[PDB]
Design a protein around this ligand. Structure first.
Ligand SMILES: NC(=O)N[C@@H](CC(=O)O)C(=O)O
Ligand SMILES: O=C1C[C@@H](C(=O)O)NC(=O)N1
Ligand SMILES: [Zn+2]
Ligand SMILES: [Zn+2]
Ligand SMILES: [Zn+2]
Ligand SMILES: [Zn+2]
Lengths: 336, 343
């Protein structure tokens, strides 16, 4: 019965893959979101303007006629990337931002200072997967350790640099972001709002809930839920929809990533509704991101209805299937 | 190449399953171990003397010609279990011990325990007759973080139980935490523990970094490195109320590598050499025989084995998988090169 009309959303953190997987997955995004930040971690990664232009065209080839969807491309930062290449792509409208992945990506921030300094000067946002990767650091501590040892030093060095702390998963990061300045923002996925590590590990191991940064303790989940529900205007929708074929997930060494594009928007609506915070929902989906990136808000509107839809058990691929996040379950809100 | 000769070991915590899976897995135990504690979590559970007798015989049927292997059977504790049934099984040599799995208010009375308070008549009987209680010590309340469940058990159940029943003999099965290590270390002669090879060799990072590894997924869940190190130090100290219990817990490959993978490591094929590797790395090989072959017997009041086996420090590759009638079994350390093997 209940209907919720919002400004059309965007997705500020998306993996579209390539090839036949890209053809399969893009329509789940393009049918809903006006734009999406398309991450650059292809094999090999998108590190040149030329590669980004080609990738962008493959994505557009795969967008059904009638979907008004614009992929916003990103550069994968590498220790050796030429700052002139990053800037050229930016000037051309090809690169919207650059993405910093930990080594096991970038080995040190120090190795890429010239690039980061260029980004700071030209006003290019830096998107950060914020985890340290030393073998001795427990996997649940890697996000927290990143804040102290990399993020805060980096932001102290480049005080004009705009940073998105991508897919934050901890109370540590939530507090860090809440207390930061207008040059620091974050994205949060649906899974890190809806679940905690118990949902991945109790009663069985659930690889479809296995993603990076790893699901944390409930106290962390609660901190993220309170953050979005507070109305804080520098957090915004980024799904980290990260699809893998079923048997790449269900194997002796399962790939990280949740394929949440089909269910994310309604999943977010449920969280906000639960937190008694639907008045902040549009801003999270459709306003906060644009503001941070200095892009206009979308000028169309969509509707969500609170009618329970059943999530497909699987989606066909050329070879194998794709298991969506919440496969076989129910979502309380769906797109009208 | 170096040789380690020990009295024939026993496995104080084992899952043998049933049917065809039992036929496949028993030889990996019977070739090496003189005795094993056979856990009772079949579907349906072993909760009667008659079922334990028939199960013991199915196990015996699957032992290869010439292996000298004796299964020591256990009773699954449930709300509806009659203390007279348990006592009779004990008195007749059928039940060596009884096994308490985590309580759950939704448990069918035929299949489990709703709360420990609700099975005090049976626990009092075990105390009275000197039957050892084997405890899977986790609390499973939905609002407890899975990594916290063992420590919460110590506080909520273990300590109060042992204060209530001061003569009760308890083995804290497959301990995984420094909490449990210290607790057991500081206990009396009526408290012991078993430790698996996976909890000595690995921590949760091994299960979750670079990929999710369901063949390392087991209960109680792998913990953070500080806990793994405490376990290692406990065994390496020569503490004589910790002993070998593999928790070898086989599931078909398709049941492990699924959207909801089953908990358990099939480590019977590789456990003993893994334990040897750990003791060696801890410079504690002088304590290795006792852990494998003496401490368990002393705790249970049974004789130490009088035959010997040899481990050799020569590298071998572990099978990638082991055929079942349908599907396959992936062993602990599948495909890896291991340092010690049985001669
Ligand atoms: N997060 C994930 O679990 N997966 C992402 C990578 C990423 O965002 O690190 C992927 O590309 O597979
Ligand atoms: O408690 C248990 C049960 C066992 C099994 O599979 O039977 N597997 C485990 O991982 N631990
Ligand atoms: Zn990431
Ligand atoms: Zn991502
Ligand atoms: Zn157990
Ligand atoms: Zn067990």
């Amino acid at each position: 019965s209940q209907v919720l009309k919002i400004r059309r959303p965007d997705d500020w953190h998306l993996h579209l893959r390539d090839g036949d997987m890209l053809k399969t997955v893009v329509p789940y995004t393009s049918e809903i979101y006006g734009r999406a930040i398309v991450m650059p971690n292809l094999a090999p990664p998108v590190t040149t303007v030329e590669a980004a232009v080609a990738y962008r065209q493959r994505i557009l080839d795969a967008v059904p006629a009638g979907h008004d969807f614009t992929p916003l491309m990103t550069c994968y930062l590498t220790d050796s990337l030429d700052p002139n290449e990053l800037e050229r792509g930016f000037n051309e409208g090809v690169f919207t931002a650059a993405k910093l992945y930990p080594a096991n990506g970038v080995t040190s921030v120090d190795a890429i200072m010239p690039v980061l300094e260029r980004m700071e000067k030209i006003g290019m946002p830096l998107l950060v997967h914020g985890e340290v990767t030393h073998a001795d650091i427990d996997i649940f501590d890697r996000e927290a350790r990143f804040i102290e040892s990399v993020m805060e030093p980096l932001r102290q060095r480049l005080t004009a640099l705009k940073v998105v702390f991508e897919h934050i998963t901890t109370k540590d990061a939530a507090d860090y972001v809440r207390d930061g300045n207008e040059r620091l923002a974050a994205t949060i996925t649906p899974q890190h709002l809806m679940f905690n590590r118990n949902h991945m590990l109790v009663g069985g191991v659930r690889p479809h809930l296995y993603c990076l940064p790893i699901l944390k303790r409930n106290i962390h989940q609660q901190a993220l839920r309170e953050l979005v529900a507070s109305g804080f205007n520098r957090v915004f929708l980024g799904t980290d929809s990260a699809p893998h074929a079923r048997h790449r997930k269900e194997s002796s060494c399962g790939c990280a990533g949740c394929f949440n594009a089909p269910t994310a928007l309604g999943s977010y609506a449920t969280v906000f509704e639960e937190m008694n915070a639907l008045q902040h929902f549009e801003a999270f989906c459709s306003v906060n991101g644009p503001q941070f990136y200095g892009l206009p808000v979308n000028d169309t509107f969509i509707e969500l209805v609170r009618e329970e839809q059943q999530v497909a058990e699987s989606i066909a691929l050329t070879d194998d299937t794709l298991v969506p996040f919440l496969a076989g379950e129910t979502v309380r809100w769906s797109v009208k």
